């Protein structure tokens, strides 16, 4: 209608290949297979037993086209710290969401401290259901907005500090309007 996608993990061809740090043991690609046997590309991490997690994942460079304000819609699922057996003084039920404004569409290592926190993201009231045949993923849907943006594009980062989290859909868009 008047929404215009700059990124939709769901419609991407082949692996996302986003940058994770650490590269292994932190955030990792996981395909959920839908009814026609086509992967939904997720990122997940569940090191709830180990202390001081600090796992980063960043998208590829995303252009803002003309837009000063963009909307980020995350479809996630958390596992409660209650539900996982075992002791866990550092378990979490949120992740952090950051953005970084850049004119360069090929930065290799962006420092954590150039990143600008948009919000801490928890399972709140809002959800979506996605019918994938054998199951219906009930997921949280959060939406945040950011701006005003001025540089050509930007990067999104997701920080985990000890949650059991599956990021199922990341959509970015602006309103043509």
């Amino acid at each position: 209608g008047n929404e215009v996608t700059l990124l939709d993990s769901r419609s991407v061809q082949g692996e996302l290949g986003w940058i994770a740090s650490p590269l292994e043991g932190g955030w990792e690609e996981v395909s959920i297979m839908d009814e026609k046997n086509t992967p939904i590309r997720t990122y997940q991490v569940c090191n709830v037993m180990e202390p001081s997690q600090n796992n980063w994942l960043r998208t590829d460079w995303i252009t803002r086209e003309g837009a000063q304000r963009v909307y980020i819609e995350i479809k996630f699922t958390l596992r409660d710290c209650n539900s996982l057996p075992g002791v866990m003084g550092t378990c979490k039920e949120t992740f952090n969401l950051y953005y970084y404004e850049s004119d360069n569409d090929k930065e290799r290592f962006i420092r954590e401290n150039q990143f600008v926190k948009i919000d801490t993201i928890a399972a709140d009231e809002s959800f979506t259901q996605v019918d994938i045949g054998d199951r219906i993923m009930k997921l949280n849907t959060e939406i945040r907005d950011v701006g005003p943006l001025s540089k050509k594009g930007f990067y999104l980062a997701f920080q985990d500090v000890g949650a059991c989290i599956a990021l199922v859909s990341v959509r970015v868009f602006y309103k043509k309007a």
Partner: peptide, 12 residues
């Protein structure tokens, strides 16, 4: 190893 993995449903 992740403690659990979501493949449409959690799975620990």
């Amino acid at each position: 190893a992740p403690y659990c993995v979501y493949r449409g449903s959690w799975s620990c």
